[PDB]
Scaffold this active site. Structure first.
Site, PDB file in Angstrom:
ATOM      1  N   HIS A  70      10.062  38.428  31.417  1.00  0.00           N
ATOM      2  CA  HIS A  70       9.631  38.945  32.715  1.00  0.00           C
ATOM      3  C   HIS A  70      10.658  38.633  33.803  1.00  0.00           C
ATOM      4  CE1 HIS A  70       5.264  40.225  32.116  1.00  0.00           C
ATOM      5  NE2 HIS A  70       5.710  39.915  30.912  1.00  0.00           N
ATOM      6  N   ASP A 105      17.468  35.561  36.993  1.00  0.00           N
ATOM      7  CA  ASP A 105      17.945  34.928  38.220  1.00  0.00           C
ATOM      8  C   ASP A 105      16.964  33.897  38.768  1.00  0.00           C
ATOM      9  OD1 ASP A 105      15.957  36.684  38.907  1.00  0.00           O
ATOM     10  OD2 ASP A 105      17.089  37.728  40.470  1.00  0.00           O
ATOM     11  N   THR A 153       4.086  30.206  14.093  1.00  0.00           N
ATOM     12  CA  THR A 153       5.183  30.307  13.128  1.00  0.00           C
ATOM     13  C   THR A 153       6.064  31.531  13.417  1.00  0.00           C
ATOM     14  OG1 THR A 153       3.675  29.401  11.441  1.00  0.00           O
ATOM     15  CG2 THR A 153       5.775  30.286  10.677  1.00  0.00           C
TER      16      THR A 153
HETATM   17 CA    CA Z   1       3.989  34.570  13.276  1.00  0.00          CA
HETATM   18 CA    CA Z   2      14.284  38.021  37.699  1.00  0.00          CA
END
Ligand code: CA
Ligand code: CA
Ligand code: HEM
Length: 366
Positions: free
Chosen positions: A48, A66, A198
């Site tokens: 994100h 950033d 996992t």
């Molecule tokens: Ca997995």
């Molecule tokens: Ca950013």
């Protein structure tokens, strides 16, 4: 020039040494050495933070990796596409003053690298340091959503940093340790594969099974039918059933991506190396690598891949597969024994009662 760190680690630049104590504090205070809830959210945040950048709109739309999510926690974390990202943001903010030599951008990406190392099978990712400690908040609309189609998804990644369809599928290997809290308003921590603690290829196999029902509601935006929908939530348990995202189903069957998707099934090393390459590229979006320094040596050696081969979950089998790729035969794999679905554990220790660290902070959700 070289220095040895206080833990004995040889580095190409003594500036990398500041990250050693950051790593220790991230583990002691949040991640707790586990591939758990907090680690997963921190990995989601690397994406994100990084992906909010656009070649076609230019620099003003966003600066990529950033630390904009941490530096402007009242802006991007509250955009609809990032609902729920507040948890990871709030967990990382305190580390900005605790480790003042380290930028928010470096913090996000190094935290992701450390979190990954807690997951058995995850690659030891590259880590370059030196992202500037100042930026501004990105605009809305830059983060892909689970209801988006493949054309849209591929365009967004190409516009963000020239990612090929192969690199996009590679990045989505991350859904091997992913769960959903916001997609279904009635469900918490609905896992995308049967092994959410996992880093394996089960996600690639299990999205290819025929969907049979839902773990919760049957009409959530961005969600489609799941092959293993049952959990123990109806009776107060915390083992939520498996959820499937529309975007994962679409990538698994689109002609541009389906062969890459199936190509990772039972190919642990190929999958982990592919994710690592695409992730390293994601981690430096908004930057010229010439302006960064290599501190890969301070990324912890990851927990090794598990012994278990890739297998069909109990009650499923090859006769349940929906295949789309003609270029490569789906491999012969064993089936886990059992007459009914196996509950997917809420916690990496196999139990349901684990708890997670959550700092209070300025970012919020709905
Ligand atoms: Ca997995
Ligand atoms: Ca950013
Ligand atoms: C088409 C692109 C993508 C879509 C549509 C997508 C969508 C989603 C959604 C809907 C969730 C559930 C959030 C919630 O409801 O709590 C999620 C979780 C997650 N995402 Fe993806 N994602 C994408 C790409 C990525 C990438 C590139 C990464 C990392 C490299 C990533 C890492 C994760 C992780 C680790 C979680 C689990 C968070 C947790 O379990 O706490 N995702 N994603």
């Amino acid at each position: 020039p070289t220095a040895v760190c206080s833990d004995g680690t040889r580095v190409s630049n003594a500036v990398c040494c500041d990250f050693v104590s950051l790593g220790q504090d991230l583990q002691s205070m949040v991640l707790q050495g586990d591939c758990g809830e907090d680690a997963h959210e921190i990995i989601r945040l690397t994406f994100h933070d990084a992906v909010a950048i656009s070649r076609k709109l230019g620099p003003s739309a966003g600066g990529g990796a950033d630390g904009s999510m941490l530096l402007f926690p009242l802006v991007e974390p509250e955009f609809a596409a990032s609902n729920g990202i507040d948890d990871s943001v709030n967990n990382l903010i305190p580390f900005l003053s605790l480790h003042p030599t380290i930028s928010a951008g470096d913090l996000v990406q190094f935290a992701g690298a450390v979190a990954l190392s807690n997951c058995p099978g995850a690659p030891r990712v590259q880590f370059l340091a030196g992202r500037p400690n100042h930026t501004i908040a990105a605009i809305d609309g830059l983060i892909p959503e689970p209801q988006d189609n493949v054309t849209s998804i591929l365009e967004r990644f190409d516009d963000a940093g020239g990612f090929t369809p192969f690199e996009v599928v590679s990045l989505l290997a991350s859904h091997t340790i992913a769960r959903a809290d916001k997609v279904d308003p009635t469900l918490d921590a609905a896992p995308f594969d049967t092994t959410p603690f996992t880093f394996d290829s089960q996600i690639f196999l299990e999205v290819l099974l025929k969907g049979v029902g839902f773990p919760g509601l049957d009409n959530n935006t961005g969600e489609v039918s799941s092959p293993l929908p049952l959990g123990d939530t109806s009776t107060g348990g915390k083992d939520t059933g498996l959820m499937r995202l529309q975007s994962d189903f679409a990538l698994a069957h689109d002609p541009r991506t389906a062969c890459f998707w199936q190509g990772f099934v039972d190919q642990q090393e190929f999958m982990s190396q592919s994710f690592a390459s695409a992730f390293a590229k994601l981690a430096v979006l908004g930057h010229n690598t010439d302006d960064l320094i290599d501190c890969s040596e301070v990324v912890p050696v990851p927990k090794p891949a598990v012994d278990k081969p890739t297998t069909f979950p109990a009650t499923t089998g090859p006769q349940d597969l929906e295949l789309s790729c003609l270029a490569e035969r789906f491999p012969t794999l064993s089936v886990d024994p059992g007459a009914q679905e196996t509950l997917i554990p809420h916690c990496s220790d196999g139990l349901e009662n684990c708890t997670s660290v959550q700092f209070s902070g300025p970012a919020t959700d709905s």
